[PDB]
């Protein structure tokens, strides 16, 4: 026939890919970082507890001034905290209480939001009327909206559970670029620090690296065995870390095109909900289903602490832009700020 | 107090935000959500439109019954986003009862009944749904009584039913074949029902079942069990 010939061509291309990836794996990250001294043990104590949510917290994001937060929850609200003094700046009532993502613009003006309603709401905080109006409602996806990350004050890239990502134009409202190629849902997104590339982790046991200027998939990374609930770049944009559901984080590398490490412990049997590196890249925090985060040494896999202060599953967390804090958020409607 | 004027005014604004949050969380603590997930081919539209005339994304229908507010979250019908539909009291299933002898369109081999029962298995046997009290309607009972006195059923399924020419026999057979799918289902009973040609008793029955569920759940926080 003809379809089987193209399938054989695809199979031999995948074999060429596997041989090219195997030809470069001369050493590992363990056989090289086995001489530097470990980090020791890292005690982190809760510094603040931010109360006021009345339901499960599903996402959060840090401002780029390292002080202001934002937190979405199934209460139906979107609160903007002041993390230094624990008081609330704004509280935004959502039109649909089924919210599963959150963002915070890199300039501080706007705030994005999204959920099961298939739309991405852009809110304008610095109005001259003293309110927080819905500045835009971006529609055009066909499945639930899992993550959204601001790029400029005019462009936003987001990922939905209809096997697509999309780069929008907040002024007009139309999809500038659509990103296709996955097979299952898409539940995670992370932008490179230079904001020309980004990576997503699908419900397909795969991650992909797109470039927002062209609209094509550069590379794809396999190796997991379950969903990929989270993703995050390395602070220099040449590696990322996925957090799966089979109780294992990993560390891929965009130039070696392979997998480097495998952060997994035998006590751990529950899936990761959120990973986030540190400022220098020597830690890898990972919130788990068993109610507590971890702190993985990201050059030798040796676990180096535990942030156990929650009493329910910990949702997305985030390390500040200047480095001074971590901020987890869990299903008991409490944020915490470790340090 | 070591706070300046703007700091004290910001703390006052925060306390006012907190008061408004507490009020909106009092208004939504006496709210009863009822998820609605049928089987597609089971006349969901007919029940929905009759409930709408008597009173892309996810849908939602607000109403009130006997001074209690109900939300009906009709999801537009997978893995990890049904874990937000916990703390949603009394999921409300819905099946067409007269669909025991037809066969699916895209699959001309398997029966529609076993497919609906497998959906029921995957939904009830979830772990996060171990605090929600499944209701179970069966529409088109008049279709069932029309199509039960003309055909037999022992030739369809191998499970023992008995005589094929009545109503109560096939009804108890259907309720047993649907109920038997659970696995150690305590603290969440299965209020089966039987909805004929459409009427006004449906929402009264749903209110009775949700009242029973909230009673059995208040009867454990008070240690009064």
């Amino acid at each position, epitope marked *: 026939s003809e379809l089987d010939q193209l399938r054989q061509e695809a199979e031999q291309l995948k074999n060429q890919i596997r041989d090219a990836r195997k030809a470069c794996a001369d050493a590992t990250l363990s056989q090289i970082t086995n001489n530097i001294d470990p980090v020791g043990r890292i005690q982190m104590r809760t510094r603040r507890t931010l109360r006021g949510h009345l339901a499960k917290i599903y996402a959060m994001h840090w401002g780029t001034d390292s002080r202001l937060l934002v937190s979405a929850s199934q209460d139906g609200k979107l609160i903007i905290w002041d993390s230094y003094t624990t008081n609330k700046v704004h509280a935004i009532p959502l039109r649909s209480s089924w919210v599963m993502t959150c963002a915070y613009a890199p300039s501080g003006n706007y705030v994005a939001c999204g959920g099961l309603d298939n739309i991405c709401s852009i809110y304008n905080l610095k109005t001259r009327e003293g309110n927080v109006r819905v500045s835009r409602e971006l529609a055009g996806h066909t499945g639930y909206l899992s993550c959204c990350r601001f790029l400029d004050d005019n462009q936003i890239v987001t990922s939905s559970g209809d096997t697509t990502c999309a780069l929008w134009d907040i002024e007009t409202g139309q999809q500038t670029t659509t990103f296709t190629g996955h097979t299952g849902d898409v539940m995670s997104l992370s932008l490179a620090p230079d904001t020309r590339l980004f990576v997503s982790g699908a419900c397909d046991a795969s991650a992909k690296l797109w470039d927002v200027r062209e609209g094509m998939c550069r590379q794809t990374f396999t190796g997991h065995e379950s969903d990929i609930n989270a993703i995050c770049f390395f602070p220099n944009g040449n590696a990322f870390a996925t957090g799966s559901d089979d109780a294992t984080c990993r560390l891929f590398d965009l130039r070696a095109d392979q997998e480097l490490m495998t952060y997994s412990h035998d006590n751990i049997i529950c899936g990761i909900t959120s990973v986030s590196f540190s400022k220098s890249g020597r830690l890898l925090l990972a919130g788990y289903d068993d109610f507590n985060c971890n702190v993985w040494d990201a050059l030798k896999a040796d676990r180096a602490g535990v942030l156990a202060g929650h009493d329910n599953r910990v949702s997305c967390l985030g390390v500040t832009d200047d480095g001074m804090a971590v901020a987890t958020g869990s299903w008991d409607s409490f944020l915490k700020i470790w340090n | 107090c070591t706070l300046s004027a*703007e700091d004290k005014a910001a703390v006052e604004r925060s306390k006012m935000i907190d008061r408004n949050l507490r009020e909106d969380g009092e208004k939504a603590a006496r709210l009863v959500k009822i998820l609605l997930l049928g089987a597609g081919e089971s006349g969901k539209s007919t029940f929905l439109k009759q409930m709408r005339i008597i009173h892309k994304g996810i849908h939602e229908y607000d109403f009130e019954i006997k001074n209690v507010p109900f939300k009906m979250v009709d999801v537009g019908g997978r893995k990890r986003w049904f874990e937000c539909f916990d703390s949603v009291t009394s999921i409300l299933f819905l099946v067409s009862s007269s669909e025991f002898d037809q066969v699916l369109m895209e699959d001309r081999l398997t029966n529609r009944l076993t497919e609906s029962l497998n959906i029921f298995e995957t939904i009830v046997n979830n772990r996060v749904f171990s605090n929600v009290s499944i209701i179970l309607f069966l529409n088109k009972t008049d279709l069932l009584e029309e199509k039960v006195q003309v055909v037999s059923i022992k030739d369809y399924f191998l499970e023992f039913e008995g005589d094929p020419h009545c109503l109560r026999d096939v009804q108890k057979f259907l309720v047993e074949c649907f109920r038997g799918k659970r696995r150690d289902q305590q603290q969440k009973p299965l209020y089966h029902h039987f909805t004929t040609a459409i009427n006004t008793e449906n929402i009264r029955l749903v209110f009775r079942d949700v009242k029973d569920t909230i009673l059995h759940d208040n009867l454990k926080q008070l240690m009064l069990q």
Partner: single-chain antibody
Amino acid sequence: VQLVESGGGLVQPGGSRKLSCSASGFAFSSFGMHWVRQAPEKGLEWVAYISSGSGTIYYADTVKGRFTISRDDPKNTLFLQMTSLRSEDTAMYYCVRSIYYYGSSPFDFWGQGTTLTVSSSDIVMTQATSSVPVTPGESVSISCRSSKSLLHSNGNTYLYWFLQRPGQSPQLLIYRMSNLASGVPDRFSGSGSGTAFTLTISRLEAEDVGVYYCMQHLEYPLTFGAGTKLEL
């Protein structure tokens, strides 16, 4: 955004009045409101402040007990009940909105004011001069010296700068000594630290002539300055 006031006119001494302030165009329910008087030729002076709900209320030490500020949210109005009108109360009265959170810009929008004529601890802030001659195209400077250190322990000085054009209502120009207000062209800069503050202007225009006032916001009463006149 619009504030407009009413209730002026000639008053007999020893009487009583009520001033009204209607606010159309913004969210009045979440905006603290100040009254600010102004003598015939003697510059601005704070009068009273009422909070965003109906909580903290403050008065100047010369109008405490006589006056009474109040607000009505569903009608979007603000009232000042003045009792025992003395001869030193003839003035033009302005409303001022101000919202307080992290990073806000209080004293946003001044109203238009009513004229009210009758028949017949405390931070002290001084201005440099009373009139300077300038030319359009020259970079100028205005100095305002406090008496207590306005640099609070959290790092932000609380000195503001307003500009009043001839025949108009003053507008916010600079808040917290460095931050520029909205709609202000990139020519005004704020500098200094501690108890010596400075506003520097680049090449000026025909719309930069007026009187410049420096406020403080550490503690009530908020004490304005004497004003420096920018004449051509």
